Structures are given as structure tokens and as C-alpha cells.
């Protein structure tokens with residue numbers, strides 16, 4: 001893992017400079033396409049894209065797992081929904097499946113810790129049948145976290161060898177907004193009350209209990225904010241670790257990764273803490289309706305492109321933003337040039 | 347025109363109720379897809395869509411015209427850029443062409459008042475070679491405004507008869523952010539300084555002159571805020587009138603219209619003033635980087651889906667948001683149902 005993190009490539013400033021120059025010469029007032037131009041330049045700096053903003057195959061990786069903390073009453077969804085929904089993922093009937101199809105992306109469902117029998121058709125990387133209840137102890141051991149990071153990292157960069165150039169990250173796990181809130185609180189240093197949300201329709205009353213659970217998880221585990229792996233293993237979950245692993249793998253592969261909602265933000269905070277070199281490869285999609293979204297994004301210094309008040313998860317937001325990445329590529333390669341039309345602007 | 351405005355259909359509450367019920371039963375926590383769900387319901391209420399969120403053919407109508415107020419030094423772009431760019435539109439090399447292609451939409455370039463010889467391949471509906479300089483008088487007569495509204499309205503609803511179910515509106519005209527700022531100031535009652543922006547890269551110094559021009563236009567013409575046609579004819583332009591006409595035509599046709607940037611916001615304010623029944627058919631795309639965008643959107647009570655800091659115009663933002671409308675339709679029709687998976691949520 002030390003090797004993996006040491007080999008993450010830095011962005012290519014040379015390709016980025018050539019990109020900027022080419023964009024400024026396009027048939028439009030300089031900088032008029034705003035964030036679409038900055039996005040194109042960002043992509044140009046990613047070594048896996050061959051010095052140019054391009055999109056080949058697209059894949060959304062969905063990490064599924066159950067959480068022990070579900071027993072603390074922090075989630076109203078039946079625990080079996082994780083297993084049932086994971087199955088539905090293979091049938092193409094879920095939100096991310098429908099949105100990924102529209103974007104022409106393929107969905108990879110990965111079981112990293114569902115508490116049920118193996119689901120055929122789902123990639124099997126399960127660490128255990130659900131992680132430990134973070135309210136009374138750690139979610140898993142440091143070794144288990146590191147191994148899963150390694151495993152998912154390799155799987156991710158291996159897909160690149162098959163044509164994939166754009167990744168989307170998602171998750172599925174009842175009660176996972178609780179460990180997500182805990183991680184955000186630890187990494188940003190915010191009080192649990194400011195970062196704990198309603199998740200998948202938790203009643204407004206039950207919120208207090210959720211906040212107490214988050215506080216208890218932190219107190220009992222004493223996770224070290226300066227060590228993202230320590231935080232993940234103590235108050236995270238298998239699905240959160242998996243998402244972090246996709247981010248490290250894509251970065252090592254020098255390829256772009258589209259974030260999704262609140263759960264992915266917590267995973268990205270862990271990833272950037274573990275390896276700052278990962279940040280240049282992260283691309284925001286939407287602004288999650290989860291309460292702690294604003295704080296999490298502020299520490300990641302990211303401004304999402306889409307404001308859809310979405311809070312489904314599954315990587316549905318990542319899929320929805322893929323057309324945007326393709327649009328920046330289309331602008332870059334298909335627009336005409338000012339000089340060719342004899343247009344001169346001051 | 348009185349007939350046209352009197353025949354705009356009200357939204358179908360019955361179809362909308364059936365839509366909401368169907369969405370609530372989808373494979374996800376109720377309301378978790380946020381604005382995507384509200385958008386699907388909105389579309390279901392539009393009589394031209396056959397009681398269901400659907401998208402057939404897509405078209406972006408680009409209204410091109412020159413403005414007399416260009417002579418007041420409010421724009422740094424050479425005036426001929428309108429004519430040159432209009433030509434480029436027919437060659438598919440402009441920003442809206444590239445983005446429309448990506449969304450699978452067709453671009454209709456309409457000349458409603460370019461100050462140059464006719465451009466082959468462009469729809470000819472020119473009122474005159476540029477409109478009057480709003481700084482010293484009206485842009486056009488009330489009759490000219492009404493006729494163009496009628497003309498564009500019919501052209502728009504006629505396209506519907508050919509399969510088009512989703513419209514996007516755009517414009518092209520050097521100096522048009524000046525009359526746009528004037529209209530916004532009049533309709534919202536905001537001071538010119540709060541609504542005048544840099545347009546297509548106007549230097550920060552020249553801003554004062556632009557503000558004075560806007561104030562002079564209003565003072566000299568004394569447009570009546572309660573009469574959108576009066577405002578359009580006095581301190582508007584041919585391109586702005588044309589965009590308003592697309593909105594009235596789509597509404598009469600009971601079909602959805604995606605707005606673009608700042609220029610389209612001013613046209614939408616005029617449209618809603620002329621006929622409030624038009625509002626239910628308007629769909630925002632992005633949040634323009636133009637200074638007066640916030641104020642204009644607030645009076646339209648709209649919250650854009652995309653924050654791309656774009657300010658190109660041409661209808662490029664409308665095209666970029668088309669995939670979003672298609673996504674709401676895909677969600678509605680392709681997602682599985684909770685009941686079928688035996689999932690029960692409180």
C-alpha cells in the first residue's frame with residue numbers, strides 16, 4: 001500500500017497549459033464557458049487521459065455493506081434492504097442503473113460486507129457479514145481496512161486496462177450516514193449536531209439519538225484525525241473503505257473519479273488525508289441534501305455542478321454528472337476557432 | 347395575439363397526481379431523488395406531453411439580432427460578430443451546436459434582425475437591420491413587437507407538430523446584455539447598478555457608462571412595468587422579443603421550454619408579465635455568471651439545476667440541461683417498484 005500511494009502521479013502541467021491555450025482560442029469570448037473550461041483543463045492534466053480531455057468507457061462502482069450500528073436505531077429502513085437492493089442492482093431496476101444507462105455507463109456492484117448470503121452476479125469482496133457496531137467499538141481492524149483498500153484499488157485500475165477512463169463511485173448500506181457523519185465530524189472538527197442528517201427519511205425526533213450515537217462512537221474509539229486509515233477502520237464501514245479505495249486506485253491509474261453524495265464526501269476526506277495527491281483526480285457531481293454536505297464540501301474545497309436536492313446514494317449523482325464531463329470534452333474537440341473566422345477580441 | 351394568450355392551457359392536475367403516486371412507489375426512499383421527482387411531475391402536467399413525463403425530439407431556437415445601442419460603447423465585441431457567428435451556427439462549430447449535438451437536439455438559427463445581408467441557411471424573420479438605439483428612443487414599435495411575437499409563436503408550436511416535445515431558447519446579438527439589464531431593472535424594480543454586468547468581457551472601467559446608458563434608456567422611454575409588450579418594444583430588442591415568443595408558443599402548445607442564461611431570464615420576465623399562465627411551462631437550466639442573474643431568478647422564483655459559471659449565451663446552457671430532463675423521464679419509466687421487491691418503508 002505504501003508503494004501504491006507513493007506511485008500516484010502528479011498532474012501534467014505541460015498538457016494543462018496546451019489545453020488552456022487551445023480553449024482560449026475557441027469560438028467564444030475567453031472564459032465564457034466557465035467551469036466547463038476549468039473542467040476540461042483538469043482532465044487534460046490526468047496522465048491516464050493521454051494529455052487531452054477525453055472519455056472512453058464509463059463505470060460506476062457501487063460498494064455494498066451492512067453496519068452493526070444499525071442496531072442502535074439510527075435507521076428506519078429494514079436491514080435486509082441492503083441485500084435486496086444489491087440484487088436489484090444486477091437487474092438494472094435501481095436509480096443508479098437507470099441513470100447510468102442514460103449516460104451509457106456500466107454499473108459494477110461490489111459486495112464488501114453485506115450481512116446475508118452471497119448474491120450471484122455481484123462481485124464478491126466481502127470482509128465480513130456487516131462491520132462492527134461503531135457505538136461500542138471499532139468497525140474493523142486496521143489490517144482489514146488496508147487489505148480492502150488494496151483489493152479495491154487494484155480492481156479499479158485493472159478496469160482502466162479494459163478501456164474505462166471515467167469512474168463514478170457509489171454505495172448501498174442501511175445506516176451508513178451514521179458512520180459517514182462520524183468521519184466528517186472527526187476530519188472537519190465539527191460538532192456532531194452540525195453534521196448529522198436525516199439519512200433515508202429518519203424521523204425528526206430520532207435525530208437526537210443518532211447524534212448521541214455518533215458522539216459515543218468517537219469517544220469510545222478515539223480515532224486519530226491525522227490518520228485517515230485509523231478513522232476509516234474505527235468509525236467508518238466496509239462500503240466507505242471501498243469508496244476510498246476506488247479513489248486511490250483511480251488516482252494511481254491517473255484517471256478521473258466523479259464523487260456522488262454525502263457518503264462519498266466522507267470517503268473523499270479520508271482519501272485526501274491518506275494521500276493529498278488524490279485531490280487533483282476528484283470531480284464533484286451534485287450537492288447532497290444531507291445536512292452535513294456543506295461542511296464536508298467546504299473542507300474538500302469543492303463546489304458541485306448540480307443542485308438537485310438528491311439524497312438517494314448508489315452513485316446516482318455521479319452517473320447524472322457524466323454527461324457534463326463528456327460536454328467539456330465535446331467543447332474542447334468540436335468547437336471552431338476564432339482565428340478561422342477572422343474574429344479578433346480585445 | 348389575444349386569442350393565442352387566451353388559449354394557453356392550464357397544467358393537468360389529474361396527470362400530476364397520478365405521476366406523484368407512481369414516483370412515490372419507485373424503488374427508493376420517498377422523495378430521495380429530490381428535484382428530479384418534482385421535475386417529472388411538472389412535465390406530467392404539460393398537456394402536450396400526453397399525461398406523462400416524456401421527451402421526443404429536441405430543438406434549440408437561437409434568435410439573432412443586432413442592437414442600435416451598440417454605438418453607445420457598451421460592447422467590446424465587433425458588431426459583425428453577430429452575422430459571422432450566425433453563419434457559424436449553420437456550420438455546427440459554435441458552443442450551442444456542439445452541446446446540442448451531444449444532447450441529440452437540433453439547432454434552429456433564426457434571424458430576427460441582424461444588421462447585415464441575409465445569411466443563407468438561416469431562418470429569415472428579420473424585422474429590420476438591427477433595432478433602434480434604446481438610449482435615445484424605442485427599440486421598435488409596439489406593432490413590430492406584437493407581429494414578431496405572433497410569428498415566432500406559430501413557428502414554435504408548428505415544430506411540435508413535427509415531433510418536437512422539448513424546446514431550448516437562445517440568442518446571439520452583440521450588446522444585448524444592455525437591453526436585458528434594462529428590462530430586468532424595470533420588471534424587478536432594481537437599480538441599474540445592481541443588474542448591469544460585464545456581458546461579453548466588458549472592461550471593469552466601461553461599466554459606469556453601461557449603467558448610465560441603461561438609466562438613460564429607461565428615463566427617455568418610460569416603459570410601463572405592468573405591460574411586458576411595452577417594455578419589450580421600448581427597451582428590449584428583436585432577439586429578446588423572439589425568445590419571449592418561443593416561450594408563449596411552447597406554452598400555447600402545452601410544451602416545456604428550457605431557459606438559458608441572463609438574456610433568457612429577461613425574456614421570461616416579459617413573458618410571465620404578458621401571460622402568467624406561461625410560468626408552469628418554464629424550466630431553468632443554469633445559473634448565469636452575469637451580475638443581475640440572482641435578482642432576475644428571484645423574481646421568476648426559479649432555482650437553476652446547474653452552476654457552471656457560464657455566460658456564453660446561444661442557448662448553450664439549455665442544451666446542457668436537456669440530459670437532465672431526459673433523466674427525470676428515465677427515472678419515471680425505467681425504475682422498479684418497492685412493492686415488487688416486497689420492501690415496506692414507514
Ligand SMILES: O=C(O)c1ccc[n+]([C@@H]2O[C@H](COP(=O)([O-])O)[C@@H](O)[C@H]2O)c1
Pocket residue numbers: 074075076077171172173174175176177178198199200201202260261262263264288289290310311312313314
Ligand atoms: O448519497 C447521499 O447523499 C445519501 C444521503 C442520504 C441517504 N442515502 C442512502 O440511504 C442510506 C443511508 O441512510 P440511513 O438512514 O440508512 O443512514 C444508504 O443506503 C444511502 O445509499 C444517501
Ligand SMILES: O=C(O)c1ccc[n+]([C@@H]2O[C@H](COP(=O)([O-])O)[C@@H](O)[C@H]2O)c1
Pocket residue numbers: 420421422423517518519520521522523524544545546547548606607608609610634635636656657658659660
Ligand atoms: O447568456 C448569458 O448569461 C450571457 C451572459 C453574457 C454575455 N452573453 C453573450 O454575449 C453577448 C452579450 O454580451 P454584450 O457584452 O455584447 O452585451 C450575446 O451575444 C450573448 O450571447 C450571454
Ligand SMILES: Cc1ccc(O)c(N)c1
Pocket residue numbers: 027028029343423427431518519546658659660
Ligand atoms: C466570438 C463570440 C463573441 C461574443 C459572443 O456572444 C459569442 N457567442 C461569440
Ligand SMILES: Cc1ccc(O)c(N)c1
Pocket residue numbers: 077081085172173200312313314373374375689
Ligand atoms: C428502498 C431503498 C431504501 C434505502 C436506500 O438507501 C435505497 N437506495 C433504496
